[PDB]
């Protein structure tokens, strides 16, 4: 395995390197405002050396924005779908791409035969090109790479079922910025190349200059080169055709033919199409083909990429004649005047790239490399668009839980085949597919209209319930005898509880166990581990009376501790009198379950403490304000300020109480320039303190923390025995124009330098850089952030993907939510003024560093600790649990999986997933599993996933999505580095 710590790869160009070379000057170039005038040698071109130009015909459809998917679908996709389907068949040489396969999938099913057998012809031969073939064109920013590989597989899934078709060739023309997390997906499902198009226009500016728009594009962490995929960055504005021809938009805009005639569009340049003559061809030639020159000499091949598209293009029959007669009059002309030394056509996305590689092959030109991201993009002036971090906090929060959901149930159901009454597989189809439709730029992003939100949050919802049907069918036939099993598939066995989503202050919805010495003393409950490792957690649930106790199913003792369950309501908390919280540390198995019962008594149990409880403000007992230090197990000492607020950690007994202050913010709006909206972050200044409370401290055994009521945040510190876990009911309630930050102060000396992740695979090293604005130093935290010195590091991990950065030296930030009355001009047509109570979830991981190993000061990336990581996978993937509905199971098991392996620490198995129904002969399971690289601080079976299940007929190595073998295993062991993921099919009899 390659080194990803001492050994620092090469590449032409690192985008950390770039941005602190880059002076980000916003010069006026001309007519290509934020580049030069190009300028071109006409003798470059002649008969021995011409320039091959690709028109590739586009139509960008978005799953959701200004109108829901199903609106867009009914008033405007499945029009383009069927001109595309009849202008194809009857123009062979007319070309066509597309991307969102939700869309094409909702279109293709509803056809009739003969239009199906018509679509698969004009795919057979390459007319109509499938492009990513995911589900949806996905944020970079905010995705978690699971997501991004489900809604991957769910579109290529769909098109080698349905059409046979795999696409190598990525098409991601609007995410607001891009991510590595793509080609190192893209690589590992077969790709051989991707296209990108906004990032920020000084980069485009500085990659122009040195023709470094196309690139091999590896991860920061490659020294070898493996993860390299060849990408190609558009360099304009934007993806419409007025900024995709070349540099200058009032031309290229005379070449949008659905800009003239009864269409009802324009050019703002002033200067309309015309249709093309015999009369004007060779000036309407001239002209468009120095512009396609012009935009060549950005680039090292005599290939050249024209897109010829927009939103929603293609929906009229008359739009097709219009654009393909009046090209096909300009290529007719070109192509037969020798002077112009060009060939031009229409074409696709992979014949573009193909042709590429071929120029490439011939000594044509030699590719640079490149490793690092696009964030955080501007399209014009100081306008970053780090407000879609946080935009629709609910969403993005909601984003994870559903992600946890999908795959605990693909895996509790993974374990056996199901008969087809059960409708296991549709449930899960459907929950696959609402979570991977979010995945849109519009989706997860925040960026959408408040009934498009309503919509994706309807769709989430009944994906969760889905999740909880298969979950609960399948806790029940994994924990009772064969011999009893019978299931009624309308049957709830179990009811899930989950005590962090919506969360208890959000939504009061968390069934209370009702117990009772008369008719139900006893409760039999059962937790999930999807991790591949032995875990133990504290686990809680309500119950109807504090007399409660533990045991296993052996009817063992397991110690307890009960609180009382207390609400927020000037802010002040009222304890309830009709449930109390039992809390205990669930023992669960790798890949498990493990089954508790809660036993009622008259009485105090033995097993069981009581949490005391004091409230301080300005039995339960009260106090004045005053500092208070707390201590959980063997777990850090936390001291709190009067407020309620953490001011040190002390993370042993005999070490120092190092002060981390937690303290909250609010930024505003501009008075007089650009306002924020949903896209945009514009402060009008740095952040200033939020005005401050009721403090309420619970101290117990197994559990203790400080809860404190602010306006707009009751804010909540837990201890268990190691990091804390924060927790944040965020209520912006009525604040226009105001943004909630949270914020920690500490002496860590980090100085410009802080960490944060990508899509929850990689953390990647930010500099501050005091000569862009405060926005522009804002990064997606879709998972974490840290800042570090040669001593002591602090790491914030993430249960939902917010913005944030590091200000100052020794401090960290993170959004929570933003209410902004202003639209922002970039199509939404709204501000954000729908935001609702969230419950934010984070753990807090001091440590000391100085005895790790940790990458140069040159290197790009960073690593987690083994606490850290654990402290992420903690709110990611917890414990699920489930309460047993009827008053007796017999056949009850205590365990299952006792005998699977635990994994190393660093490895999981992010995906199990039966690809096979139950008719199939063969019985196919795929694996996904994650290496990470945690750092090595001087602090376990082999796994072998195609012998978890019996009757292992043969195992395969494949590609992410399931889709493509890649390797037959030798004695059907399943062997991965780290930073790799692989993915393995094991096919059973
Ligand atoms: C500014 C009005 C014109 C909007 C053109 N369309 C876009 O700018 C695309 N980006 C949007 C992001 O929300 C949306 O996905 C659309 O696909
Ligand atoms: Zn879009």
């Known amino acids: 395995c390659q080194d990803v710590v001492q050994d620092v790869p090469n590449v032409d160009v690192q985008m950390l390197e770039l941005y602190d070379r880059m002076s980000f000057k ?182 122009a200059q040195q023709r470094q728009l196309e690139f091999l594009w590896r991860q920061i962490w490659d020294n070898k080169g493996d993860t390299a995929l060849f990408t190609h960055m558009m360099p304009f504005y934007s993806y419409d055709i007025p900024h995709t021809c070349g540099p200058d938009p009032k031309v290229c805009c005379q070449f949008d033919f659905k800009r003239m005639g009864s269409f009802g569009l324009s050019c703002p340049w002033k200067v309309p199409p015309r249709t093309i003559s015999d009369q004007n061809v060779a000036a309407r030639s001239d002209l468009l083909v120095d512009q396609w020159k012009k935009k060549a000499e950005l680039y090292r091949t005599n290939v050249l990429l024209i897109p010829l598209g927009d939103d929603f293009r293609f929906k009229q029959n008359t739009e097709w004649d219009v654009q393909r007669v009046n090209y096909e009059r300009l290529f007719e002309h070109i192509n037969s005047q020798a002077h112009f030394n060009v060939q031009a056509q229409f074409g696709t996305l992979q014949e573009y790239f193909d042709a590429v590689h071929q120029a490439e092959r011939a000594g044509q030109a030699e590719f640079p490399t490149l490793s690092g991201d696009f964030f955080t993009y501007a399209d014009r002036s100081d306008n970053y668009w780090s407000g879609y971090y946080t935009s629709r906090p609910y969403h993005k929060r909601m984003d994870r839980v559903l992600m946890h959901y999908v795959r605990a149930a693909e895996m509790l159901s993974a374990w056996h085949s199901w008969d087809g009454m059960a409708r296991i597989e549709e449930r899960l189809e459907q929950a696959r597919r609402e979570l991977s439709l979010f995945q849109h730029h519009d989706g997860i992003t925040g960026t959408a209209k408040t009934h498009v939100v309503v919509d994706y949050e309807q769709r989430m919802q009944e994906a969760l319930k889905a999740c909880q049907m298969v979950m609960q069918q399948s806790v029940y036939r994994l924990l009772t005898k064969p011999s009893i099993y019978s299931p009624d598939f309308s049957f709830s066995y179990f009811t899930l509880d989950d005590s962090r989503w919506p969360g208890s202050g959000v939504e009061d919805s968390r069934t209370t166990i009702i117990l009772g010495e008369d008719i139900l003393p006893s409760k039999h409950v059962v937790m999930h581990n999807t991790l591949p490792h032995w875990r133990e957690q504290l686990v809680d649930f309500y119950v109807s009376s504090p007399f409660v106790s533990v045991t296993d199913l052996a009817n063992n003792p397991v110690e307890a501790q009960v609180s009382p369950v207390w609400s927020w309501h000037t802010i002040h908390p009222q304890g309830s009198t009709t449930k109390y919280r039992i809390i205990f540390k669930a023992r ?402």
């Open 588 to 989: 669960v198995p790798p890949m498990g379950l493990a089954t508790y019962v809660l036993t009622i008594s008259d009485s105090k149990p033995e097993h069981t403490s009581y949490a005391s409880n004091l409230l301080l403000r300005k039995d339960v007992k009260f106090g004045d304000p005053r500092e208070i230090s707390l201590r959980v197990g063997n777990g850090p000492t936390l001291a709190f300020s009067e407020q309620g607020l953490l001011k040190s950690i002390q993370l042993t007994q005999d070490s120092p109480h190092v002060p981390v202050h937690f303290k909250f913010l609010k930024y505003g709006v501009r008075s007089h320039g650009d306002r924020s909206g949903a896209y945009l972050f514009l402060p009008n200044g740095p952040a200033s303190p939020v005005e401050l409370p009721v403090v309420l401290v619970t101290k117990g055994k197994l559990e203790s923390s400080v809860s404190v009521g602010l306006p707009s945040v009751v804010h909540q510190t837990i201890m268990r025995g190691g990091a804390p876990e924060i927790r944040n009911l965020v209520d912006i309630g009525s604040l226009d124009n105001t943004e909630i930050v949270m914020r920690l102060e500490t002496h860590i000396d980090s100085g410009d330098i802080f960490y944060t992740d990508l899509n929850g695979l990689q953390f990647i090293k930010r500099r501050r850089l005091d000569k862009l604005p405060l926005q522009a130093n804002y990064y997606p935290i879709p998972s974490g952030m840290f800042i570090e010195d040669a001593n002591t590091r602090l790491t914030l991990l993430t249960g939902q993907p917010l913005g944030g950065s590091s200000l100052a030296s020794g401090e960290l930030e993170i959004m929570q939510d933003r209410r902004l009355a202003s639209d922002d001009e970039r199509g939404l047509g709204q501000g954000v003024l729908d935001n609702k109570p969230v419950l934010h979830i984070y753990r807090l991981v001091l440590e000391k560093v100085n005895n790790c190993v940790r990458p140069s000061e040159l290197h790009p990336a960073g690593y987690l600790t083994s606490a850290a990581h654990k402290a992420s996978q903690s709110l990611l993937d917890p414990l699920d649990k489930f309460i047993f509905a009827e008053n007796e199971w017999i056949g009850a098991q205590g365990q299952f999986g006792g005998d699977h392996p635990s994994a190393r620490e660093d490895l999981d198995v992010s995906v199990m997933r039966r690809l096979t129904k139950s008719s199939a002969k063969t019985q196919r399971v795929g694996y996904v599993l994650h290496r990470t690289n945690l750092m090595q601080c001087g602090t376990t079976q082999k796994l072998d996933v195609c012998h978890l299940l019996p009757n292992v007929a043969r195992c395969e190595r494949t590609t992410l999505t399931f889709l493509q073998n890649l390797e037959h295993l030798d004695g059907m062991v399943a062997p991965v580095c780290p930073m790799e993921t692989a993915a393995y099919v094991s096919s059973h009899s």
């Open 26 to 207: 916003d010069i006026d170039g001309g007519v290509w405002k934020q580049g030069w005038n190009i300028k071109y040698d006409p003798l470059k071109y002649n008969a021995h050396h011409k320039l091959k130009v690709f028109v590739v015909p586009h139509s960008h459809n978005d799953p959701g924005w200004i109108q829901t998917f199903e609106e867009y679908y009914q008033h405007d996709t499945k029009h383009i779908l069927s001109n595309a389907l009849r202008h194809l068949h009857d123009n062979p040489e007319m070309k066509f791409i597309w991307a969102e396969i939700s869309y094409f999938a909702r279109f293709y099913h509803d056809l009739g035969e003969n239009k199906k057998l018509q679509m698969k012809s004009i795919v057979k031969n390459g007319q109509l090109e499938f492009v990513t073939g995911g589900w949806v064109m996905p944020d970079e920013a905010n995705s978690h790479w699971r997501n991004v590989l489900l809604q991957l597989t769910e579109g290529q899934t769909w098109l080698k079922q349905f059409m046979n078709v795999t696409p190598t060739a990525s098409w991601a023309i609007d995410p607001f910025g891009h991510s590595p997390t793509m080609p190192y997906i893209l690589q590992k499902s077969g790709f051989k190349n991707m296209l990108i198009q906004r990032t920020h226009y000084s980069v485009k500016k500085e990659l």
